[PDB]
Amino acid sequence: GFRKMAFPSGKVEGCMVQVTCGTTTLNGLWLDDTVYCPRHVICTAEDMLNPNYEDLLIRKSNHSFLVQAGNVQLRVIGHSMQNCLLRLKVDTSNPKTPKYKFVRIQPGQTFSVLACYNGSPSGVYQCAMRPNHTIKGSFLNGSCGSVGFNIDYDCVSFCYMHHMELPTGVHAGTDLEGKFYGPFVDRQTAQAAGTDTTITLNVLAWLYAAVINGDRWFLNRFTTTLNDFNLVAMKYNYEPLTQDHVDILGPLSAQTGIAVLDMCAALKELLQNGMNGRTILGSTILEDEFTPFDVVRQCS
Amino acid sequence: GFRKMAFPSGKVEGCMVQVTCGTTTLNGLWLDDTVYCPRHVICTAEDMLNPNYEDLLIRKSNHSFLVQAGNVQLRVIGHSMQNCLLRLKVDTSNPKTPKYKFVRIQPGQTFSVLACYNGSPSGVYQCAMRPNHTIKGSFLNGSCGSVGFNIDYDCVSFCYMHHMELPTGVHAGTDLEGKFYGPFVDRQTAQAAGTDTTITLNVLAWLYAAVINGDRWFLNRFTTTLNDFNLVAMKYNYEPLTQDHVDILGPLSAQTGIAVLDMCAALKELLQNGMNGRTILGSTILEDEFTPFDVVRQCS
């Protein structure tokens, strides 16, 4: 039917390093003469419950950080903290640094994650930021420091760095300025994901994709309004829709001829009676990790 | 719950080229001083119904093939045919050639596909060879020449090249010796996928993964035998199981303590009554594009 596709990972692979302090190793991101990694690399098992990061960091020598690219040591010559990241100054600029920028993404948006083990890339996956500010993700197990990204023609937009696994096994992390997505903290403490919800905009996008594919069976038999839509959505643990969501679906509506509120109607009826024994795009679930942007890029 | 992860694509990205003949463009694979591409690149719209490949090829000059790496022309200096592939000799060895080999995979096995547009990589996905020798794939739309692969530490095992879209929109292709998977032909003709089935071994693997994850709810309440298992499988359009499949599940059985025939029992009961309103690894479908090998690599 329709596959979740990740961005090609080559540009990011050449930026993955290992960073070791003491007995703790994780992944860092080497761009130009900086390596970024989770600041929790400086913690012992005992530090991790309530780490004095500022104190811990200022006590550390540059020599205490072992940064390896493959097997090659890059000497650190400065360290500073940025929110919940370390910015390590290294003695070599990465010759493989791509064109990049750093972006903070919004809940609901998608990105690719290059899962790594101690600086070795092992695989790539496509995911979304959940409304509860986690990633369901479930590979980032022990690959803290692994990064999430989007690629716009030649430019790499880094948007996530993995820091922690929460109790449910979902992943929590920061943007590349070191600011957590969601209310989580980089310590080993009592914290849980909020209740999650289904990304309604993304489901609508996927319903447009199904239309783009040639599916029309599920088109609405009745009209809805945004309010009446949101009463059902929520019974079904879907995120409520706003007019601004309605607008985002503009181009897809244009491409397909199926008005946005007609599609909201179709989703309401799919939820209440249609997805009983039926499939769309070959699937029995309503996919929510494709954005309107993703659908246009892949289905057009 | 559990994500399908593709291999990192960097090694393959640096091998993607565009090959043009006449008005037809597609992707080729540049390794050492050879470029491989679908031989149907030499066809016109009219050739494509019943192409005389041998004649077409022998009439062609080397100059008639435009091979571009990015925007850089590689001059072809010989062409020969290999089954349904062209092997073009080019004047430059790819400096980005990784360690590679070519393997033919079996139905049921998995691989990563780097989907490209006219030699530009656009995304990566993980899929399986269907029992009916197609890929459900649904991105390979206009990216003939795109390749499928597995990566074993440092070595790239190329196993697929995309050639055609069949009427259902599934993809058909060859191994890197140019031999089709399945009964398909590289012409525009009357040919269809066979009826497909569910990859039973892979579903069993995923049930082991669920156990590895901490799920035990679905464990069998009754015993089965291989024969009695295969009567149900088939009602449900699952591929029958053999003893050799039973054996392949050896290591997973070892790791989990759940005997293989106990897991077959659990699947039979999941099919007949358990997957009614319930989920495994967060999903309401029984996943069949993870092999026993994949599960060990990802869940261990």
Swiss-Prot record, chains A, B:
Superkingdom classification of source: Viruses
Reactions mediated catalytically: TSAVLQ-|-SGFRK-NH2 and SGVTFQ-|-GKFKK the two peptides corresponding to the two self-cleavage sites of the SARS 3C-like proteinase are the two most reactive peptide substrates. The enzyme exhibits a strong preference for substrates containing Gln at P1 position and Leu at P2 position
Span of domain Peptidase C30: 1-300
Intervals, Cytoplasmic compartment: 1-300
Subcellular location as annotated: Host cytoplasm; Host Golgi apparatus
Active site residues according to the UniProt entry: H40, C144
Result, substituting D247E: In strain: Isolate BJ04
Function text: Cleaves the C-terminus of replicase polyprotein at 11 sites. Recognizes substrates containing the core sequence [ILMVF]-Q-|-[SGACN]. Also able to bind an ADP-ribose-1''-phosphate (ADRP). May cleave host ATP6V1G1 thereby modifying host vacuoles intracellular pH.
UniProt subunit comment: Exists as monomer and homodimer. Only the homodimer shows catalytic activity.
Protein name listed in UniProt: 3C-like proteinase nsp5
Organism listed in the record: Severe acute respiratory syndrome coronavirus (SARS-CoV)
